[PDB]
Amino acid sequence: SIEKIWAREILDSRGNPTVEVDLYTAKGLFRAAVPSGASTGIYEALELRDGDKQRYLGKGVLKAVDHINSTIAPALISSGLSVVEQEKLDNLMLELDGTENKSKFGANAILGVSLAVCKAGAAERELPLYRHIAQLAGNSDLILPVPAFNVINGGSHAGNKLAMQEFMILPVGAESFRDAMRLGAEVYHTLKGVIKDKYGKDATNVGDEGGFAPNILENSEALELVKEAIDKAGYTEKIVIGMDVAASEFYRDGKYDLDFKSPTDPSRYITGDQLGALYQDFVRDYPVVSIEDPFDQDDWAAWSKFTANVGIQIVGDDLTVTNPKRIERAVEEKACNCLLLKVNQIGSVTEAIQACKLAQENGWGVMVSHRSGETEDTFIADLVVGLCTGQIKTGAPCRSERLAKYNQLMRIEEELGDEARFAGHNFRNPSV
Amino acid sequence: SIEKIWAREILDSRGNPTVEVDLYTAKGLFRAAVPSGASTGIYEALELRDGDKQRYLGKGVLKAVDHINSTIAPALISSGLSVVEQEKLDNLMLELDGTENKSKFGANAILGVSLAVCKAGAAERELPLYRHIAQLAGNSDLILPVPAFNVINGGSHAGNKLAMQEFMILPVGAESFRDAMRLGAEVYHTLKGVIKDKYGKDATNVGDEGGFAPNILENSEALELVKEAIDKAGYTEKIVIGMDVAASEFYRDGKYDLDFKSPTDPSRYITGDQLGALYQDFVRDYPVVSIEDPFDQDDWAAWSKFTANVGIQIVGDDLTVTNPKRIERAVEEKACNCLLLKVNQIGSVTEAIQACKLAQENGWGVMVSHRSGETEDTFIADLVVGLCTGQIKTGAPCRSERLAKYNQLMRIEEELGDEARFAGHNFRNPSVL
């Protein structure tokens, strides 16, 4: 059973409080922490913050922590359920909170326990984490995913004018996971120089996810820099490009604002048809193979029309928020062909696994994802392997809240030894 | 005894390779990894790199990793020594290397085993890491250090003109380590707002250690920005300022170039006297209580004279490189009154505890330090408690290779319960508490 749970406030990678949980069994101690987004969709389960403006500027998580220490912990303990029963323990937590969006305890409260139970569960089974997860998910071929490295940053929170949030590289042609990391790192460090040469040393500092934020406006120019770094590294044949537009962040009165970090002005705003045609030029002119949140989380028509007019991967994030009910609708409407999977959008492991199986059941790709506020926790590296999804984005190869995950994928690859496989060019559908 | 040792290459926080080590005993797996400097002292132990231009720009550590797997690991397994015997295991390795600066295997090879052995030993003793360290050190006060947070990055850690490396805030007034975390973070976030309003959002990206990299040249202006944020956060009484100049990075033919990241022009260079005088202004205009590497690593005359002429903490880093020989010379010349402690400048736990005790017996402070290239490893967190040094610099409260250490110190404080004490205004000299 569970002997003890102890939750506390720690600092995530931007220096804001988040929830960490210690859960103890007769096997020992298991610790997990909860990440936090900046471009959070309106449909995500509630991140409970304290809002005491005199303390971490309103961002403390004492209330979430106390819900764990005062309510969740006593309950789960006295239940006497084994930590192998992921689903029953998660449902219990879900009934206890009693709300649909987990607004009673916070999803950051429930998830911190849910992850730590999962780690306890692995060890109760004497499996490493990635194999326990695969058992919870009915999987067997524990493929290593292609990493997607966020190398240039724009968007809502970025010190520059660049509207589109993330421009990523995917080493689809590397020989193994370890190899992909090496390609990603070389391109990254090459990019830095390409930026320094073109823009000045000032332009080479990092944003939240470890990528660079040059002082540029044109999304075509970012892609241009990324493709140059890929050539100059010499991997044109091995590395492709993915984008996270995060379009909800610049949605304005039913049109779209590509300049939005400027102080307001509706004359620039373009329509979804105009924004769709830009992407089609991007897909024609650059090796872009994936685009995430190309439209607002509510602009369903633009998603379906786009998806039915392209061959590339189209990824729902803010559209789907790892939520089964929202995914069925995207399925019905053929909104996209890939789920971005964020445990903290829905708020328990069990519901994330279910979101995963539903996407995969209906022929979708699935990409596991960090939040832009991460911790040293590495759960998601085990999650992507265990879920056989074949793709993960968890940062630039820079800042150790991103590398903690990359390094742990290398450890998994090495742990699988001779039986380890890399998704490479089958990242969208590694089930082949 | 040790059952097996597996080393691998992982990536550090700048996305370069570094050593990590998995050590197996009866108790299980003990893992540690090796950090890596950018402004590395000329006298530092050798960090062994591959030098293969077709692989991570020559920055691979395949060689150091193979030294561990193929030579050091059977060496330590054959000895049959318990992991608790830090000193014996460290000497074993130092003798097998047999060079002064560890250039046969690399400081990076030796250290990663040394750290792992260390964590395995704490498990064997049934002790948390910081207590085991305290026992190797012969301490039983486990005081929590004042954290020194590098909130504006310059020099070799940031893409800007700003020449001095590090502008640090020290919550000397804090009630506890956990409360020092809150003050640090609130000032950091306040400073993001100050820098944003004054220089634009483009000035709020960060350099290697998590501090803002604003587009500035004047070191006075960085100090100014920090003061302003302290004040706006409401903490002028409770928080003071520290600097790492690292003048070695900008020492140019007997002079100093405060614009070294600009196209070379030797007229802009100033003498060490001018540099010193500049330090005297900072000390009077700002609550600067500590300055690290204010002169070049070989510029001993400028060091002794500046130190005899101030009552603040003066920190040796590239001057001392965590090395007992260089420390003795610094004590004799009165170069400085604080040691910067960096396991990887010297290359083993045992050596680093020895360099520490040395400083403390000569009445020096000791500030434990991360490197600019870090990992998810939280060793130095337990190390600073176990060594009772009362001060640690391990980043801005931003980037988890920093926050993994700060979060660990909060966990250690919480674990000490009511026995927990906070160094505070005693960060130079915590033994009196």
Ligand SMILES: O=C(O)[C@@H](CO)OP(=O)(O)O
């Ligand atoms: O103080 C220093 O000099 C260190 C650590 O902050 O930087 P580097 O690791 O680059 O030497």
Ligand SMILES: [Mg+2]
């Ligand atoms: Mg988002």
Ligand SMILES: [Mg+2]
């Ligand atoms: Mg997104």
Ligand SMILES: [Mg+2]
């Ligand atoms: Mg240095």
Ligand SMILES: [Mg+2]
């Ligand atoms: Mg230094």
